[PDB]
């Protein structure tokens, strides 16, 4: 349980940093990696 919490905690922090790092290229990763919008619905 605590492992699951820990992992899900860090990956959201990766994505929210990923949104504004580079304008176009790195931004395209966020659409593929957040398809279901299950992220930002966790926070």
């Amino acid at each position: 349980r605590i492992l699951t919490h820990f992992y899900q905690g860090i990956v959201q922090q990766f994505l929210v940093l990923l949104t504004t790092s580079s304008d176009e290229s790195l931004r395209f990763l966020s659409f593929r990696l957040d398809f279901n919008e299950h992220y930002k619905a966790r926070e």
Partner: protein, 181 residues
């Protein structure tokens, strides 16, 4: 340009510089990592290149990579980096394409270093992915015997979920490494 691409076949070098060195073929690579599983999981302080070359030969003759020219195939060989007392084979490993032509002017050493860096990055991720596929196979095999052990069904189900979280992330990143990269 005419004499460079026929007498020395400059373009074949690029075609084999993606397929092999930049891990552009992967029939070759999955069998290569499969044969290099028990050797590279063992700590690499006792690793010497002569054990790598001989199994490399079997792997290249068996797979699709066999069908290209023996020259560029000969210019492909392994190399290692320096050792540590914490070293394991997946940490220290390299493919090194050695140049025997005058093509070095178009394939300068700085871009060879670039090749090396992108290869290392694409080596670690392909190792961990196969670890994850191993986990999924272990899930798919062991669990049909643990139907007669009822009490583990909680935790065993819960593991099933977390795998699906990784399987997603490791199958989308590896599609971003497929396309646009």
């Amino acid at each position: 340009l005419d004499v460079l691409n026929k007498k020395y076949s400059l373009l074949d070098h690029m075609q084999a510089m993606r397929r092999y060195l930049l891990l552009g073929q992967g029939d070759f690579i999955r069998h290569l990592m499969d044969l290099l599983k028990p050797e590279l999981v063992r700590p690499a302080t006792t690793l010497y290149q002569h054990n790598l070359t001989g199994i490399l030969e079997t792997a290249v003759r068996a797979t699709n990579a066999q069908f290209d020219s023996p020259e560029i195939l000969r210019r492909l060989d392994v190399r290692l980096l320096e050792v540590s007392p914490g070293d394991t084979g997946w940490d220290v490993f390299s493919l090194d394409y050695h140049v025997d032509g005058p093509i070095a002017t178009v394939f300068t050493r700085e871009c060879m270093s670039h090749y090396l860096r992108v290869f290392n990055f694409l080596w670690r991720a392909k190792r961990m992915e196969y670890i994850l596929t191993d986990i999924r196979k272990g899930h798919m095999c062991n669990a049909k015997l643990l139907r007669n052990m009822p009490e583990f069904s909680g935790v065993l189900h819960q593991c099933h979920i977390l795998a699906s979280e990784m399987v997603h992330f490791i199958h989308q990143m590896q599609y971003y490494i497929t396309f646009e990269v």
